[PDB]
Swiss-Prot record:
Origin species: Homo sapiens
Protein name per the record: Acetyl-CoA carboxylase 1
Segment of the intact protein contained: 1058 to 1484 of 2346
Domain notes: Consists of an N-terminal biotin carboxylation/carboxylase (BC) domain that catalyzes the ATP-dependent transient carboxylation of the biotin covalently attached to the central biotinyl-binding/biotin carboxyl carrier (BCC) domain. The C-terminal carboxyl transferase (CT) domain catalyzes the transfer of the carboxyl group from carboxylated biotin to acetyl-CoA to produce malonyl-CoA.
Gene: ACACA
Source taxon at top rank: Eukaryota
Post-translational modification: The biotin cofactor is covalently attached to the central biotinyl-binding domain and is required for the catalytic activity.
């Protein structure tokens, strides 16, 4: 009964009634995401029930589902810093890295421990078709100082290594302060170069707020991948934007990553070309076709197209730069058998 009103209200195209049509859209599009209790319960159920005795032959598949489902669980996965079991660290890190590094071809993952608070996991993968064998790993910490306290210990596993660091600071988003704190460590301590060689160091702040620092050639900062894990730098073709200066726009259901790009111009002629880019990631398990994938393609096409248009509508009306050639890119992870 409210859906009819909201969908009628969003059709008021005259600019006098924009505020109401905008807000209604925000409601209608926002009322598809579970309200965080369902995600907490499902995710913690899987991650905590596998723990008692791993290998019940259904827990494995449930972890796989968490890796290869549509719903984003990156708002829950960083909560398994330890939680209480200390074994769930292992599982959560596995799912996190495997879901984030969907595009990288992983082959060898392993869980390592220390006799304190340091669940480490090492990963060995390769790059299928992008600058073509790197290695990596991930570890969590507490507050900030626990990172530096044993920073030299956790590294005792060409700069091919990648390290991910997740730090429990569940209070008060302060991006400037966070960035300053991380810059101090990366500018003073050069273990990333002298120990074995780490290409990039990524900090996850706990929804998630990513900060990436490369202590190799450029200044230890990255304005492009702020609030985005750069493991998705191949899933979404961001290298095709050298000619533009980009600003990311936050939105609900942040599988639809929106950027506003302004053409690079000289110091003479001003900027007249502004364009939105929707870059989406569609996660789902592979399909076996028995002439049964048509509904999947049709439904996902329609659903994703409508969501793209809705998010773009909101962000299009929130600014005034008069864009011309907006673009939508949908990258589907699963393979489908179809002509």
């Amino acid at each position: 009964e409210l859906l009819n009103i909201l969908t009628e209200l969003t059709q008021l195209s005259k600019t006098t009634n924009a505020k109401v049509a905008l807000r209604a859209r925000q409601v209608l599009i926002a009322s598809h995401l579970p309200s965080y209790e369902l995600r907490h319960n499902q995710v913690e159920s899987i991650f905590l029930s596998a723990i008692d005795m791993y290998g019940h032959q259904f827990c494995i598949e449930n972890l796989q589902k968490l890796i290869l489902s549509e719903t984003s669980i990156f708002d829950v996965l960083p909560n398994f810093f330890y939680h209480s079991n200390q074994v769930v660290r292992m599982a959560a890190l596995e799912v996190y890295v495997r879901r984030a590094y969907i595009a990288y071809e992983l082959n060898s993952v392993q869980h390592r421990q220390l006799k304190d608070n340091t669940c480490v996991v090492e990963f060995q993968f390769m790059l299928p078709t992008s600058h073509p064998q790197r290695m990596g790993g991930m570890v969590s910490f507490r507050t900030f100082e626990d990172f530096v306290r044993i920073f030299d210990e956790v590294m005792g596993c060409e700069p091919i290594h990648i390290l991910n660091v997740a730090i429990k600071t569940d209070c008060d988003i302060e991006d400037d302060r966070l960035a300053a704190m991380f810059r101090e460590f990366t500018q003073q301590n050069k273990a990333t170069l002298v120990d074995h060689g780490i290409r990039r160091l990524t900090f996850l702040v706990a929804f998630p707020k990513f900060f990436t620092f490369r202590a190799r050639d450029k200044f230890e900062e990255d304005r492009i991948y702020r609030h985005l894990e750069p493991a998705l730098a191949f899933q979404l073709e961001l290298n095709r934007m050298r000619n533009f200066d980009l600003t990311a726009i936050p939105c609900a259901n942040h599988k639809m990553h929106l950027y506003l790009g302004a053409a690079k111009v000289e110091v003479g002629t001003e900027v007249t070309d502004y364009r939105f880019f929707v870059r989406a990631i569609i996660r789902h398990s592979d399909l076996v076709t028995k002439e049964a994938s048509f509904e999947y393609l049709q439904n996902e096409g329609e659903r994703l197209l409508l969501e793209a248009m809705d998010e773009l509508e909101v962000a299009f009306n929130n600014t005034n730069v008069r864009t011309d050639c907006n673009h939508i890119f949908l990258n589907f992870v699963p393979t489908v058998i179809m002509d």
